[PDB]
């Protein structure tokens, strides 16, 4: 259990070695160093979990040093490990190890092998810092490092400027989220004097007995930081554009690491959100609206990576809905299961991309079941887990827990929105599956696919996170109510799959009729561009910034303070006209000065 810092030390050592190698090492050696760093991180995580369960699920604390100590401002470099930290650590380490093995197969013959593995190792180390931190500033360190690694890995193909623009968009939107999170940190330290989670929870109700406006503001900015990192409303536009990176980058960002940081932040600081119920209800509303908009955006999209991106956005909206209905255990369970099947779906999508000679349009694709059976079965079980196919997939159990927690707490509209989102989720998932894999034909990587194949089935739901005693228990539903809720969810999923088979498995005749109609084309163009959010943020934040930069590029204040210089030059040039060199004018000026001096002496006397 004392090797808790090794889960950061090994990826850091791997990142340093692969960065300073500069590609001089062989591809086999670089792959060995990278996937071995992540593999020993996962092995140390497994030993940590064994020791944690052997110790009776006791919360472990390992300080290393004091980060800063200025008077009452004491921030320490301490790691903490509870059931939630162990769950996210195991998810990050295991899924990152599988993605790293698939990347070691996948990045063969590419320039930047060691750079890719160093950036992913730094990503893993920063996520372990994020999930293991006990105070808000150390978690902010992990937060910003994770954002930096996401920026570095999205624009991995630096030759194409679109990847760089996507990386800029991702880093800028996530930095706005981090600035809101910084606001939350400032308010919490100003009110409570500490940033440790346990101490914040302990001294929150004593300090906020009279006034609760500052704690409400702090939880609101925590929600703003979470939706900045988790790609929710209103900071969700970076995901689809920043999907231009490699497939293992996409799997690491969408399944393992990046979008789950907001869910971890809300679940970790759940006490402060519990004493401010309106902010938690806002978390639930934001998650519901985000999952609905993500589903409607993924319904009409023609890119498989973009469809998986909006599917990930809808699943994070589901987790935020679970957090808003105080179903914390359901949210973390859905986090684990969604990490498993989204990693499987993304790695199988990369296999499809490599098999289809770098084609990324779903309508160009056709009949890939016959060419590649293993990847097709991967996509089948991944879409079955994503669409919550009942009794055989972990996604069904996770969404059932989320909807039962929403129903038992009196949240009816959120449960209705979740059911509609599940219907649309099955719709777009099997729509893309049937478009890609049906129609007319036009040991390093198999092992992670097989492991994620097993983990995307009910075997993934057999793993229960040890969240008892860390997160509060959800209120239990009645047997009849939970039975009819499970029946309704299964019926909705099967009806969505069957209507997707009615629409896209055959010849799309009525689908073309809706697509070519004027309200149909209006709705398709609206949902294709993410409901105009990217256009709005271009016209409200980007274009005035560019206009102000273009206006100020000539430095107006420099000219304003250079105005006295041109005044002095003009005055000197004007005064030099008196030196015409004429003696009679000199005598006249002497007499003028005599008159002026005498008149001034007579006036002032």
């Amino acid at each position: 259990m004392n090797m808790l810092a090794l889960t950061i030390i090994l990826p850091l050592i791997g990142f340093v070695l692969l960065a300073f190698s500069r590609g001089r090492w062989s591809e086999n050696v670089s792959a060995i160093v990278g996937v071995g760093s992540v593999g020993l991180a996962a092995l140390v995580t497994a030993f940590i979990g064994v020791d944690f369960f052997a110790n009776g699920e006791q919360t472990y604390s390992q300080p290393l040093w004091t980060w800063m100590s200025v008077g009452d401002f004491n921030i320490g470099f301490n790691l903490v490990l509870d059931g939630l930290s162990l769950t996210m650590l195991s998810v990050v380490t295991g899924v990152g190890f599988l993605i790293h093995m698939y990347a070691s197969w996948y990045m063969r013959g590419e320039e930047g092998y060691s750079r890719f593995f160093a950036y992913t190792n730094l990503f893993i180390a920063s996520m372990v810092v994020l999930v293991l931190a006990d105070n808000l500033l150390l978690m902010y360190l992990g937060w910003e490092g994770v954002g930096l690694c996401s920026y570095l890995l999205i624009g991995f193909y630096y030759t194409d400027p679109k990847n760089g623009a996507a990386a800029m968009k991702a880093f800028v939107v996530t930095r706005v989220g981090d600035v809101f999170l910084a606001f939350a940190l400032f308010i919490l330290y100003n009110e409570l004097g500490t940033l440790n989670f346990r101490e914040m929870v302990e001294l929150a109700p004593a300090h906020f007995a009279d006034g609760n406006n500052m704690l409400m503001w702090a939880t609101l900015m925590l929600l703003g930081g979470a939706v900045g990192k988790s790609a929710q409303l209103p900071l969700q536009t970076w995901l689809a554009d920043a999907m231009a990176g490699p497939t293992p980058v996409s799997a690491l960002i969408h399944a393992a690491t990046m979008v789950t940081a907001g869910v971890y932040l809300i679940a970790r600081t759940h006490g402060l959100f519990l004493m401010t119920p309106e902010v938690l209800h806002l978390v639930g509303i934001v998650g519901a609206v985000t999952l609905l908009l993500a589903g409607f955006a993924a319904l009409v999209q023609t890119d498989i990576k973009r469809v998986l991106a909006y599917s990930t956005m809808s699943q994070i909206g589901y987790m935020f809905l679970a957090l808003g209905v105080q179903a914390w255990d359901a949210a973390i369970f859905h986090l684990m299961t969604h990490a498993f099947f989204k990693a499987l779906l993304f790695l199988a999508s990369g296999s499809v991309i490599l098999a289809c000679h770098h084609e990324q349009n779903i309508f160009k694709m056709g009949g890939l079941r016959k060419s590649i059976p293993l990847v097709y079965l991967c996509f089948l079980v991944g879409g079955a887990a994503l669409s919550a196919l009942p009794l055989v997939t972990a996604g069904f159990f996770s969404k059932d827990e989320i909807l039962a927690g929403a129903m038992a707490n009196g949240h009816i509209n959120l449960m209705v929105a979740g059911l509609v989102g599940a219907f649309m989720t099955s719709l777009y998932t099997f729509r893309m599956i049937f478009i890609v894999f049906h129609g007319k034909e036009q040991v390093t990587h198999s092992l992670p696919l097989i492991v994620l194949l097993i983990l995307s089935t009910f075997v993934g739901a057999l793993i229960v996170p040890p969240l008892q005693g860390v997160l509060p228990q959800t209120t239990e539903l009645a047997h009849g109510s939970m039975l009819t809720l499970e029946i309704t969810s299964g019926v909705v999923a099967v009806v969505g799959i069957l209507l997707a088979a009615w629409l896209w498995l055959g010849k799309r005749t009525l689908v073309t009729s809706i697509a070519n109609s004027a309200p149909g084309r209006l709705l398709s163009t609206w949902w294709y561009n993410a409901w105009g959010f990217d256009w709005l943020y271009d016209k409200v934040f980007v274009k005035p910034f560019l206009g102000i930069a273009w206006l100020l590029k000539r430095d107006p204040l420099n000219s304003m303070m250079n105005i006295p210089a041109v005044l002095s030059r003009f005055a000197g040039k004007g005064l030099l006209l008196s030196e015409n060199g004429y003696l009679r004018w000199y005598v006249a000026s002497m007499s003028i000065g005599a008159v002026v001096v005498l008149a001034l002496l007579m006036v002032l006397r």
Partner: protein
């Protein structure tokens, strides 16, 4: 004791650099290297023997070391030096940046290298004397004597690709700004001394004696305004800022002049040491105007830095934005914000030194500074784009680098004081990330937009890579372990903060 030798070793080293040029053309660089080696060794010896971590705040004055000698006894003027935690930290930073400046110009085998080296040492000695002097006339004397070698270096040894007239104009504008501001500061000092003389009857320029001077409200405001105008020119604070990009553009191609006296933040030290203790009520009244000037400076510098097509001007405007952050920190009256200001100035010095050194290397390889004539240099260079990426991530406030630590302690203290300026400054940090990414992708990412950027370029030298990696290691260690720097300056920050808040 060692403070006169700390000031005088650069001057004797510069004289020896000029005189030993007859022994050979490769001699004065070694003399300058041993000169700043001895200076940095003396600074580290003072750090070890000072016991700064165990020193508690006892109130102004409290100096860890002190030297006094009468200089002009008619006016009560003395060469009076004093070192404490903040002054020792800035002296150590001055010594390290001087070592980097000597090592950066190692390949100059020009026929007049002795005068260049002598001017560099006179600049460094002037900066050390500014950080060490606690006599007003001596502090002003150093403040103005360190500008003549900067003027001559910019004007004669500056950017060789540019025309001579641009170098002369930039050097003259920088000199006019700094010296007019210094003359305003001298007027404020003289009026304060005359007020003290009318109040007590003794001639003095010593800063410890001028602290307990009874001033009416409004006269103190004028003296504070003179001091702040000098420090606002030198910091820079908007609109007294254009001299900094103009001097950085026409600086010598190596970048040693930037590291010598330009990148060392003497003006904020003067604001912490002289503006706040001597005029506490006037500074308390002036705090909203100064902090809104800092906000305007942050956003103005960010918008200028995004709009620059030149790397050197871009880094100069990054300096403008970070100095706006420090200016916001100084007028808060908070211990946390002051400690964050100290950390931010040290980290900004390190990061901007690395950025300017790497810009000099990049101009050496590609023979241009326009960002439209480059692009996709990651595949054409070995070490430079990754280190430039590290430094650009450092100046946007990334944790693991000391800039984040300094800026976040600044914002924590400021939010403990005033929330609105803090939130606007954090959006300024967003703007800082924006301009850092813009510089990175216009410089090293994309396709080659010219012909010189499409060819393979030679790698950096072992000494140059050594000093760049030394800067990298120092920035990382400051980001992860800033505690010894915090305990070094804890007594001076405590004394200044208690004097500021216990006299208002």
């Amino acid at each position: 004791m060692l403070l006169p030798w700390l000031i005088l070793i650069p001057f004797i080293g510069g004289f020896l650099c000029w005189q030993t040029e007859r022994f050979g053309v490769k001699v004065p660089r070694w003399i300058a290297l041993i000169t700043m080696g001895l200076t940095l060794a003396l600074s580290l010896q003072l750090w070890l023997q000072g016991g700064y971590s165990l020193t508690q705040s006892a109130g102004i004055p409290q100096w860890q070391s002190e030297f006094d000698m009468p200089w002009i006894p008619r006016f009560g003027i003395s060469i009076h030096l004093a070192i404490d935690g903040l002054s020792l930290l800035m002296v150590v930073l001055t010594g390290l940046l001087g070592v980097l400046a000597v090592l950066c110009s190692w390949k100059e085998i020009e026929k007049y290298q002795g005068f260049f080296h002598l001017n560099l040492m006179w600049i460094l000695g002037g900066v050390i004397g500014v950080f060490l002097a606690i006599d007003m006339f001596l502090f002003f004397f150093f403040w103005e004597m360190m500008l003549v070698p900067m003027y001559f270096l910019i004007a004669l040894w500056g950017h060789k690709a540019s025309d001579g007239k641009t170098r002369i104009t930039a050097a003259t504008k920088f000199f006019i700004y700094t010296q007019a501001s210094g003359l305003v500061m001298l007027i404020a000092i003289l009026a304060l001394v005359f007020v003290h003389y009318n109040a007590t009857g003794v001639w003095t320029f010593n800063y410890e004696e001028l602290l307990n001077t009874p001033m009416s409200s409004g006269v103190e405001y004028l003296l504070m305004l003179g001091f702040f105008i000098a420090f606002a020119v030198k910091m820079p604070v908007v609109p007294l800022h254009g001299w900094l990009p103009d001097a950085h553009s026409q600086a010598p191609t190596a970048g040693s002049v930037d590291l010598a006296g330009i990148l060392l933040k003497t003006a904020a030290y003067g604001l912490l040491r002289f503006s706040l203790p001597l005029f506490p009520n006037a500074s308390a009244e002036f705090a909203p105007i100064a902090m809104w000037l800092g906000v305007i400076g942050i956003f103005y510098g960010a918008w200028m830095a995004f709009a620059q097509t030149d790397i050197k001007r871009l880094i100069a405007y990054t300096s403008v934005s970070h100095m706006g952050f420090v200016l916001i920190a100084i007028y808060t009256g908070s211990q946390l914000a002051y400690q964050g200001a100290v950390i931010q100035m040290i980290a900004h010095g390190l990061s901007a030194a690395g950025l300017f050194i790497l810009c000099g290397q990049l101009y050496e390889r590609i023979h241009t500074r326009d960002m439209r004539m480059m692009g996709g240099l990651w595949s054409k260079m070995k070490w430079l784009p990754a280190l430039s990426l590290f430094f650009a991530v450092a100046t946007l406030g990334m944790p693991g680098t000391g800039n984040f630590v300094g800026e976040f302690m600044i914002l924590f203290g400021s939010f403990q004081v005033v929330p609105v300026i803090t939130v606007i400054s954090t959006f300024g940090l967003v703007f800082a990330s924006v301009y850092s990414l813009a510089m990175l992708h216009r410089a090293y990412f994309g396709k080659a937009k010219s012909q010189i950027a499409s060819q393979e370029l030679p790698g950096m030298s072992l000494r140059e890579l050594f000093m760049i990696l030394l800067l990298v290691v120092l920035l990382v260690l400051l980001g992860f372990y800033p505690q010894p720097i915090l305990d070094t300056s804890h007594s001076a920050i405590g004394n200044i903060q208690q004097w500021f808040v216990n006299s208002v």
